[PDB]
Amino acid sequence: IIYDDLSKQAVAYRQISLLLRRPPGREAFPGDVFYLHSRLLERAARVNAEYVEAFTKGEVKGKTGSLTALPIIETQAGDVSAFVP
Amino acid sequence: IIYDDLSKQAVAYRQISLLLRRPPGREAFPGDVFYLHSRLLERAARVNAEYVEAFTKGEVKGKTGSLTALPIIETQAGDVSAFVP
Amino acid sequence: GVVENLASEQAARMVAMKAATDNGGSLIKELQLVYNKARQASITQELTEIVSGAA
Amino acid sequence: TGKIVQVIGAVVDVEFPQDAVPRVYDALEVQNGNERLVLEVQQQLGGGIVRTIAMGSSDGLRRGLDVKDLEHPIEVPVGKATLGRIMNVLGEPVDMKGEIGEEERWAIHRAAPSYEELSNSQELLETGIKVIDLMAPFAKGGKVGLFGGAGVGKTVNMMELIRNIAIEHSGYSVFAGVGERTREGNDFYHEMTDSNVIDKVSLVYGQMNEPPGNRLRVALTGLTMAEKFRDEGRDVLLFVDNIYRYTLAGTEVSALLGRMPSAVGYQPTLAEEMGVLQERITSTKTGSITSVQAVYVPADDLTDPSPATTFAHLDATVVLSRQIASLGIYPAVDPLDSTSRQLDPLVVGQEHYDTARGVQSILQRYQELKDIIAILGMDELSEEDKLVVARARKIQRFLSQPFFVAEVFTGSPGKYVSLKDTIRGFKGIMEGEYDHLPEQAFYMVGSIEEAVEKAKKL
Amino acid sequence: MATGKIVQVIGAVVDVEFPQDAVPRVYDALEVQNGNERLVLEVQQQLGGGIVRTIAMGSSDGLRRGLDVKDLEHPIEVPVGKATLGRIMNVLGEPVDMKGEIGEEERWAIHRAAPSYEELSNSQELLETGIKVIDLMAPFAKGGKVGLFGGAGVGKTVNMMELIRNIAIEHSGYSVFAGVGERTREGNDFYHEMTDSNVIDKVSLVYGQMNEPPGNRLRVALTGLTMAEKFRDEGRDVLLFVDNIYRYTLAGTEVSALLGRMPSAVGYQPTLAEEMGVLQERITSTKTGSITSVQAVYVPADDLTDPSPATTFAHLDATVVLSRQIASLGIYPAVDPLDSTSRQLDPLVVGQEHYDTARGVQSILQRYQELKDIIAILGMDELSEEDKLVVARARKIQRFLSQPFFVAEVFTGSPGKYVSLKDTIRGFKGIMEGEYDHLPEQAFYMVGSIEEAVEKAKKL
Ligand SMILES: Nc1ncnc2c1ncn2[C@@H]1O[C@H](COP(=O)(O)OP(=O)(O)OP(=O)(O)O)[C@@H](O)[C@H]1O
Ligand SMILES: Nc1ncnc2c1ncn2[C@@H]1O[C@H](COP(=O)(O)OP(=O)(O)O)[C@@H](O)[C@H]1O
Ligand SMILES: [Mg+2]
Ligand SMILES: [Mg+2]
């Protein structure tokens, strides 16, 4: 899975948060923006064959599954110091 | 017409604007600061004779009027790249 | 000829280092305008986020 | 049927009966003394209150004025009757000519075309300008953006592109004036009429003296006319005089609408407001819009959120810079930031692609040498680093060109340079067949021939 | 019975109302049924009459207004002691290894006061790591705290894994591992590493991973610390490994914003120094027993200067800062000798032998850094002969600070090395006094011991 510009996703979530009048944070991003990206990227996993058997109710045996993520972020003039990067 | 410091007008409008709690922008001026100096200077114009005739109800024919403006801006250390300049 | 060229080297290095020292000082005076402008902008932006952060 | 109940700046609140409250974006109307004022609905608040932006001067409003609810959006004259005429944001005629004989009117708020309806084209559009269609060539039916700070040639470049493209374009053209000097608009209108090309251009003006609601919506009026000529199946040119002013007029209103500020005090909805305009100025399977947009960058800061989000919406981006204009080099295009989607070996051929990457590689390497040149001067460079610096300075000067609209300034006659001729010149400098001419020979010359001729005159 | 009702839900912050007689105390815990699932809430504030503001210790999704809430009249209490060894638990102390119930005999509360001033201990027993730069420049005691300071991708996790191999196996006692905002992949890698090492039965693990809600990430550190305090009060000597303290402060920042606290500098919560201090002070060694602590701290952007790295520096006895510069140049470990130090680097205890060697290295490497900039202008051509010896010693010393790790053989193919304190003193003093510039610069690099350094030069 390739997420193009997760930086754009964050700006959409900032718009929603400020229109709902939640307390703003750094660069006016909502405080819970880390939890936005954190609970998305942690879905990219390799799962052992016992989870795949337990999930597929035994229909698939002995194979591991995997989801690989490649998020893309844009930095303004290279500054790794910004809040979303 | 000479305006002896439009930078000092912007500071005075910034004072009034911030005393009315209006959210500041770049260098703490409001976004209305473009609109402030725009609507002022855009009156310094030359007008065609049909405007002068229609304005003066025909009492002046064929002449064209003008207002010439020399605004002054003071800039810090010669920085031509600051906001109000 | 060799000894004259050696004295000409020392006089050429002297005038080169003079020009280098002046060009270094002239670059300090430009970097300090960049630094001070970034200093002031960082204070204004952080204090805007604080004041606009309450209420 | 409704009453004004608050008046803050350009924003007006109106109370209506609970069964009669306006839809979003409906147009309301008010007597402001002897004037008529139009209000556009932005938000519905609780209790039949509705909050609106005045499409005219807000001065002289009392509370308690009766407001009339016109039950439709702002709708503008459209089609072949709109051609060669100047209009308000409200689609009213602003030249002294009579009524616009329109057969049809469209609402200025529209959805963008479906993903299924889009269309793609690789067809290069040729321009007179050496740097632009060397470094950032652009195609029929695509978007071009000129970025720059104040006073660096955004307008002069767009006025040359109007001249040069209208040589090979036959169909109609639309010009949206959003927030630029009126004097320009008048000079352009008299240029178009004195050359009789006006019969094919439709102009919308909401210049910088007008209050925020005009400047916000006038951009949309310009698009709505271009979208008609596109849906008639034509191919069309749209020039937009400064698209930054649309987002700034949104900033001037945003806090009065009661929205918490975002980032550098911008409206929180900035990226949606920019997208919802830019996504409808596109070509399609029925017809194509080719567009050039000027994009002012505040305080020369290329990283401000408004410039930064605009860069993603464009196919060719040309970035002007004050440091090059200060050296006299016009057009003050920066070859190390200007780029295009169309600069591909497959689209432009290998020789063009290879010449453009050669020019960038040399000019970047010259930037890497400037710090040592600044501290120690040039005599401490390597013996081929001196050769790179000599070629890079010649390349920098050969990017400069005389423009037919700059005769009022330079006085020098203007030049048109074909693509084949410019790539041959740059390739020859990079191979060094001209490495015996002086730098001054390359300044303000149309073609390489003219540089060797100028070197004969010293 | 259940005696309160939910009145708001805004993200992770749940407001609950109770009758004015039975309002839950601060840090008390409440329980609600979210769909089929039992959810715990922790009370942050009493605000107005009868309402309390709380943080959800689980997903907030699916809560309605008007759900009944029950006040468990105590803080979150977790199972402690011998029954936790070999088990993985969450913030609530439930078992997440799928091996069944914990089977504990005692439960303690995760919120408690620190040891009294009268109860503290001073002892300076030198621990030994086998890592050249640490044992030279930042030697550890027992009962002290060790900070590993670094930005993203500089070796905090590799160094913590090597330190776990070296210290724990020799420790002959219990240990606790706390994963605060740790990557689930790395938590699985560590668990499998511990069971393949067959050391898992002396270590208790608490994990609160990155995907977990802010309340989980906030309170996990206190759960792991409460287990370490149980083993300490039994009178034992224990290791506590905390895999990043920064995400404790950061979970507090996400929480703080919607708790309605007015923001502070750099967007941090007002309570940052208080919240850090209330955690770090519990982590000490008393007259009854000893906790030894190794902590990683994330420094944002390598800044080292923003409030969270700044506040944490005060609490630690040993500080190892890992630098992007050395890591990027490709030398490992990336420990900066000019910013790393321990309060055990005292002439008295370490003896003059070690102290004068360390201060000698530090003085050379600072002189090298001054020359290094103007060397770009002068090359070595216009540098002097006094400079040329110093730079030669400095570069080869700066190579001899590298070492290959048994953990990092995966990255490197070369076997891990171990180096004793006496040997690394002998090697650095050997270049300090013996000045064996006979040998190429790579002969000092990634070798480990002094004998292997000369043997590598003998081979090339
Ligand atoms: N090709 C050129 N040759 C000579 N002079 C030029 C050229 N381009 C620009 N200039 C000079 O620089 C001025 C600034 O450019 P222009 O008139 O386009 O304003 P601008 O850069 O568009 O600023 P604004 O965005 O405010 O209109 C020109 O009016 C002229 O004075
Ligand atoms: N001693 C080492 N040997 C080889 N590679 C290392 C060493 N220390 C760190 N690295 C590299 O650092 C990266 C992992 O560092 P890690 O500590 O996991 O990141 P962080 O410190 O941000 O948690 C990998 O590139 C790994 O190869
Ligand atoms: Mg312009
Ligand atoms: Mg880690």
Give a three-class secondary structure readout of chain E. CCCEEEEEEECCEEEEECCCCCCCCCCCEEEEEECCEEEEEEEEEECCCCEEEEEECCCCCCCCCCCEEEEECCCCEEECCHHHCCCEECCCCCECCCCCCCCCCCEEECCCCCCCHHHECCCCCCCCCCCHHHHHHCCCCCCCEEEEEECCCCCHHHHHHHHHHHHHHHHCCCEEEEEEEECHHHHHHHHHHHHHCCCHHHEEEEEEECCCCHHHHHHHHHHHHHHHHHHHHCCCEEEEEECCCHHHHHHHHHHHHHHCCCCCHHHCCCCHHHHHHHHHCCCCCECCCEEEEEEEEECHHHCCCCHHHHHHHCCCCEEEEECHHHHHCCCCCCECCCCCEECCCCHHHHHHHHHHHHHHHHHHHHHHHHHHHHHHHHCCCCCCHHHHHHHHHHHHHHHHCCCCCCCCHHHHCCCCCCCCHHHHHHHHHHHHHHCCCCCCHHHHCCCCCHHHHHHHHHHC
Amino acid in the structure at residue E365: L
Chain interruptions in chain B, by residue before each (C–N > 2.5 Å): none
Q: Token pair of E51, please?
A: 């309402």
Q: Between chains, do A15 and D303 touch, taking CB under 8 Å as contact? A: no
DSSP lists the bridge partners of residue D70 as D27
Among residues E34, E60, E75, the one where a domain terminates is E75
One domain for residues E157 and E228:
yes
How far apart, in whole angstroms, are the C-alpha atoms of residue B63 and residue B48?
Answer: 8
Q: Whose CA is nearest to atom 11 of ligand 1?
A: D153
Q: Tell me whether residue D355 is exposed, middle or buried, using C-beta atoms within 10 angstroms of its C-beta: 0 to 12, 13 to 18, 19 or more.
A: buried
How far apart, in whole angstroms, are the C-alpha atoms of residue D425 and residue D395?
Answer: 10
Which of B16, B34, B41 should one mutate to test binding to chain D, selecting the residue with the greatest count of D CBs within 10 A? B34
Q: Between chains, do A12 and D271 touch, taking CB under 8 Å as contact? A: yes
Q: Token pair of B2, please?
A: 């000479």
How far apart, in whole angstroms, are the C-alpha atoms of residue D106 and residue E330?
Answer: 64
Closest listed residue to residue D288, CA positions, set D73, D50, D113: D113
Distance E153 CA to ligand 2 centre (A): 6
Distance E161 CA to ligand 4 centre (A): 10
How far apart, in whole angstroms, are the C-alpha atoms of residue E456 and residue E460?
Answer: 6
Among residues E344, E378, E398, the one where a domain terminates is E344
One domain for residues E173 and E295:
yes
Residues 6+ apart with CB under 8 A from D17: D1, D2, D48
Q: Tell me whether residue E50 is exposed, middle or buried, using C-beta atoms within 10 angstroms of its C-beta: 0 to 12, 13 to 18, 19 or more.
A: middle
Amino acid in the structure at residue A45: A
One domain for residues D9 and D64:
yes
Instruction: Enter the resolution in angstroms.
Output: 3.6
Per the CB < 8 A criterion, the answer to whether D153 and D303 are in contact is no
How far apart, in whole angstroms, are the C-alpha atoms of residue D297 and residue D148?
Answer: 6
Per the CB < 8 A criterion, the answer to whether E184 and E210 are in contact is yes
Residues 6+ apart with CB under 8 A from D229: D79, D171, D172, D174, D236, D287
Among residues E47, E75, E103, the one where a domain terminates is E75
Per the CB < 8 A criterion, the answer to whether A44 and A69 are in contact is yes
Residues 6+ apart with CB under 8 A from E38: E31, E32
> Does the C-beta of D151 come closer than 6 Å to ligand 1?
yes
> Which ligand does the CA of D149 lie closest to?
1
The SS3 assignment for B4 reads: coil
Q: Between chains, do C53 and A23 touch, taking CB under 8 Å as contact? A: yes
One domain for residues D161 and D145:
yes
List own/partner pairs for C40-44 with CB under 8 A and 24 or more apart: C41/B27, C44/B27, C44/B28
The SS3 assignment for C16 reads: helix
Min Cα separation E257/chain C (Å): 9
- Let me know if D181 is a catalytic residue: yes
The SS3 assignment for A66 reads: strand
Strands D235-240 and D201-206: unpaired
How far apart, in whole angstroms, are the C-alpha atoms of residue D223 and residue D225?
Answer: 5
Torsion sign over Cα E177, E181, E184, E189: negative
Q: Token pair of D272, please?
A: 């949606």
| C49 interfaces chain E, CB cutoff of 8 Å | yes
One domain for residues E421 and E288:
no
- Alpha carbon distances (Å) from D338 to C38, D298, D310, D315, E212: 26, 18, 14, 11, 44
Of A15, A28, A76, which has the smallest distance from its Cβ to D308's Cβ? A76
> Does the C-beta of E140 come closer than 6 Å to ligand 2?
no
Per the CB < 8 A criterion, the answer to whether A29 and D261 are in contact is no
Q: Between chains, do E263 and C46 touch, taking CB under 8 Å as contact? A: no
Q: Token pair of D203, please?
A: 């102009």
A14 to chain C: which residues are within 8 Å by CB?
A: none
**Peptide linkage before E333 cis (omega within 30 of 0):** yes
How far apart, in whole angstroms, are the C-alpha atoms of residue E252 and residue A25?
Answer: 13
Q: Residue D125 belongs to what domain range?
A: 74-342
Per the CB < 8 A criterion, the answer to whether E60 and E11 are in contact is yes
| C39 interfaces chain B, CB cutoff of 8 Å | no
How far apart, in whole angstroms, are the C-alpha atoms of residue E67 and residue E14?
Answer: 11
Closest listed residue to residue E336, CA positions, set E348, E325, E349, E350: E325
Q: Token pair of D408, please?
A: 């009022």
Distance D153 CA to ligand 3 centre (A): 7
To the nearest 10°, the Cα dihedral for D163, D165, D166, D168?
Answer: 140
Q: Tell me whether residue C18 is exposed, middle or buried, using C-beta atoms within 10 angstroms of its C-beta: 0 to 12, 13 to 18, 19 or more.
A: exposed
Amino acid in the structure at residue D356: A
Strands E203-209 and E175-182: parallel
Min Cα separation A26/chain C (Å): 7
One domain for residues E83 and E149:
yes
Instruction: Please state the φ and ψ torsions of residue E362, each to the nearest 5 degrees.
Output: -60, -40
DSSP 8-state symbol, A45: -
* Helices D448-456 & D419-431 angle (0-180, nearest 10): 60
One domain for residues E391 and E355:
yes
Q: What is the 3-state secondary structure (H, E, C) of B7-70?
A: HHHHHHHHHHHHHCCCCCCHHHCCCHHHHHHHHHHCCCCECCHHHHHHHCCCCCCCCCCECCCE
How far apart, in whole angstroms, are the C-alpha atoms of residue E135 and residue E333?
Answer: 13
One domain for residues E197 and E208:
yes
Residue D40 maps to which CATH number? Answer: 2.40.10.170
Amino acid in the structure at residue D341: R
Closest listed residue to residue E264, CA positions, set E253, E274, E275, E255: E253
How far apart, in whole angstroms, are the C-alpha atoms of residue E374 and residue E381?
Answer: 11
Rg over CA atoms, chain A: 18
Q: Could you tell me how far CA E126 lies from the centroid of its own chain?
A: 20
Residues 6+ apart with CB under 8 A from D397: D329, D439, D440, D442, D443
How many CB atoms are located within 10 Å of the residue A28 CB?
A: 23
**Intra-chain end-to-end CA distance of chain B, in Å:** 19
How far apart, in whole angstroms, are the C-alpha atoms of residue E447 and residue E456?
Answer: 8
Domain total in chain E: 3
One domain for residues D116 and D215:
yes
Ramachandran sector of residue D233 (left: φ over 0; alpha: ψ -120 to 50; beta: rest) = left
How far apart, in whole angstroms, are the C-alpha atoms of residue D149 and residue E441?
Answer: 52
Distance A32 CA to ligand 4 centre (A): 21
Closest listed residue to residue E375, CA positions, set E367, E383, E363: E383
One domain for residues D66 and D93:
no
Which partners does chain E have (≥3 C-beta pairs < 8 Å)? Answer: A, C
CA angle at D193 for the pair D192 and D196, rounded to the nearest 5°: 90
Min Cα separation D29/chain C (Å): 36
> Which ligand does the CA of E405 lie closest to?
2
A32 to chain E: which residues are within 8 Å by CB?
A: 11-12, 214, 254, 257-258
Amino acid in the structure at residue E392: A
How far apart, in whole angstroms, are the C-alpha atoms of residue D399 and residue D303?
Answer: 26
Amino acid in the structure at residue D391: R
One domain for residues D307 and D383:
no
Closest listed residue to residue E31, CA positions, set E53, E4, E66: E4
Per the CB < 8 A criterion, the answer to whether E371 and E391 are in contact is yes
Of B23, B28, B79, which has the smallest distance from its Cβ to C44's Cβ? B28
One domain for residues D154 and D288:
yes
- Alpha carbon distances (Å) from E421 to A58, A75, D47, E169, E433: 55, 45, 79, 18, 18
